[PDB]
Swiss-Prot record:
Modified positions (Cysteine sulfinic acid (-SO2H)) in chain numbering: S216
Entire-sequence positions represented here: 1 to 299 of 435
Primary role: Tyrosine-protein phosphatase which acts as a regulator of endoplasmic reticulum unfolded protein response. Mediates dephosphorylation of EIF2AK3/PERK; inactivating the protein kinase activity of EIF2AK3/PERK. May play an important role in CKII- and p60c-src-induced signal transduction cascades. May regulate the EFNA5-EPHA3 signaling pathway which modulates cell reorganization and cell-cell repulsion. May also regulate the hepatocyte growth factor receptor signaling pathway through dephosphorylation of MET.
Gene from which this protein is expressed: PTPN1
Enzyme category, top tier: hydrolase
Modified residues annotated as N-acetylmethionine in this record: M2
Binding annotation for substrate: D182, S216, S217, A218, G219, I220, G221, R222, Q263
BP term (GO), one: endoplasmic reticulum unfolded protein response
Cysteine sulfenic acid (-SOH) modifications at: S216
Residues recorded as bearing Phosphoserine in the entry: S51, S243, S244
Nuclease is among the record's keywords: no
Protein name, UniProt field: Tyrosine-protein phosphatase non-receptor type 1
Numbered residues of crosslink N,N-(cysteine-1,S-diyl)serine (Cys-Ser): S216-S217
UniProt source species: Homo sapiens
Protein family (similarity comment): Belongs to the protein-tyrosine phosphatase family. Non-receptor class 1 subfamily.
Amino acid sequence: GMEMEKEFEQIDKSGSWAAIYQDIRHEASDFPCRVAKLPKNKNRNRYRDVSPFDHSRIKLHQEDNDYINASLIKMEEAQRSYILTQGPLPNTCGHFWEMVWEQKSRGVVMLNRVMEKGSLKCAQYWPQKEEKEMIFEDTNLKLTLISEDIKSYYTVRQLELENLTTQETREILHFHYTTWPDFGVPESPASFLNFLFKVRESGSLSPEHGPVVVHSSAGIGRSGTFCLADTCLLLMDKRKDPSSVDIKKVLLEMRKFRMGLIQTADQLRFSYLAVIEGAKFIMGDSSVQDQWKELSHEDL
Ligand SMILES: [Cl-]
Ligand SMILES: [Cl-]
Ligand SMILES: [Cl-]
Ligand SMILES: [Cl-]
Ligand SMILES: [Cl-]
Ligand SMILES: [Mg+2]
């Protein structure tokens, strides 16, 4: 089969995933995060050990404090960008939506739940009920739930974001994967790819929009897995050449822009599985998309 498939089988046969993953960690970029570590920003960071590099951090367009824990992953060869961010805190939900507005994002991909393992891993940063809209007074934004489509393991929401200064409104699509555990993997390649293709189908990743926002709790593990698989499939798609993609090199390129992307060796292995499976679609087996939808059990 494909070259990534041959490397996959070699690594599985030798039981080498931990060593492969540790090599990536060792080779990964190390750039300063001075702004993230300023005293005044301590309460804007969810995790002490997860910070945006200065070079790639998203700046808020405000004079007071322009800091958010968010990074622009700009994949030059693939011609796709993503914004990866932590799950917003109770005091940074206004900042989060400010960033969405200013960066002209059409979609937000949320890969975590608000409560995981008994702890609050993300703030409730969007409205749960149509009739209870949210106002972010610090950033002068209003957010309303317009509709939601609840599936067995993910939910898609239509939100309306309004800049109260100008009264301009935009439709934001929210893609919420609700069964992906932290430091874990999706139930199957099919369930993951079914969801990724839902995001793709929406047009949220179009170059006509700002970068999609992808987040988890830390904005690196589940978020890294999602973007690695998406970028690798896009690279193969541009060239129509699966054997042209080097998944580990792509991950190291991504890690130039945000630290710590992909948090376990099993998330790396899963990324391979997802790309190998998705290649079937890229190379012209259109019917596999329906198979994923069936295998994902999304209706239940
Ligand atoms: Cl300071
Ligand atoms: Cl949730
Ligand atoms: Cl829980
Ligand atoms: Cl929180
Ligand atoms: Cl790491
Ligand atoms: Mg995470």
